[PDB]
Each structure stands twice: as structure tokens, then as C-alpha cells.
Design brief:
The structure is cut from a larger assembly and holds 2 copies of chain A (about 50 residues). Chain A is mostly helical and about 50 residues long. The first copy, chain A, has helices at about 1-5, 40-50. Chain A is flat and about 45 Å long. The longest helix of chain A is centred in the C-terminal third of the chain and has 9 residues, at about 40-50. The interface of A and B includes residues 36, 39 and 41 of A. Chain A: Homotrimer, with large domains that extend into the periplasm, interacts with AcrA and TolC. AcrA may be required to stably link this protein and TolC. Interacts with AcrZ. Part of the AcrA-AcrB-AcrZ-TolC efflux pump. Chain A: This is Multidrug efflux pump subunit AcrB. Chain A: Belongs to the resistance-nodulation-cell division (RND) (TC 2.A.6) family.
């Protein structure tokens, strides 16, 4: 299905299954948070994310 | 009050974190009781009243 809706769509559409331990991660994988310390604003932080 | 006691009016946003807005007299016109005399109240008609 990800194969069906990858190529033949104008926007991205996933088809998938929940893990067994929901609300609590995969195996190879992390959740990084980029945080504002000096008050650099939405644009500088965003750009930093890029 | 807002002369001698102060007033929390509304909130404004400093550098991207919200802080307060207090309006109050300057120092020198609210120390000794005589300074009570400096303050006038605008009436119904349009006149200041001590």
C-alpha cells in the first residue's frame, strides 16, 4: 500500500500497523528535541532545524 | 490606586516569553502625603478636580 500511494499520489499517504508496545517506541529509533535557550525566535530555531 | 498601589493591566511578550504590565506613578509624586494634591480627576463635563 505504501507502494501504491507513494508514486501515484500528489501528497504523502502511509499505510501501517501499530507496534505491540504502543506509546513507547520502536527498536532502532529516537526522539530528539531542539530547544531554544537564548530567545532566538521561531525563524532562527526553525532554520537551525533545517 | 493605579497611582499609589499600581495596576496589572494586560500581558505583553518579552523576547518570546510573556511578562506583565504595571502602570503606576513616578517615584517623586507619591512619597509624602502632600503629593496627594498633585492628582486631578477629570469630571463629567471636562474639568480637572484636585
Amino acid at each position: 500500500a505504501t507502494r501504491a500511494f507513494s508514486q501515484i499520489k500528489d501528497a504523502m499517504v502511509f499505510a501501517f500497523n501499530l507496534p505491540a508496545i504502543v506509546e513507547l517506541g520502536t527498536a532502532t529509533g529516537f526522539d530528539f528535541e531542539l530547544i531554544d535557550q537564548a530567545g532566538l525566535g521561531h525563524e532562527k530555531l526553525t532554520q537551525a532545524r533545517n | 490606586g493605579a497611582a499609589w498601589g499600581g495596576s496589572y493591566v494586560n500581558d505583553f511578550i518579552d523576547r518570546g516569553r510573556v511578562k506583565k504590565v504595571y502602570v503606576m506613578s513616578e517615584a517623586k509624586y507619591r512619597m509624602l502625603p502632600d503629593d496627594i494634591g498633585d492628582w486631578y480627576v477629570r469630571a463629567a463635563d471636562g474639568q480637572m478636580v484636585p
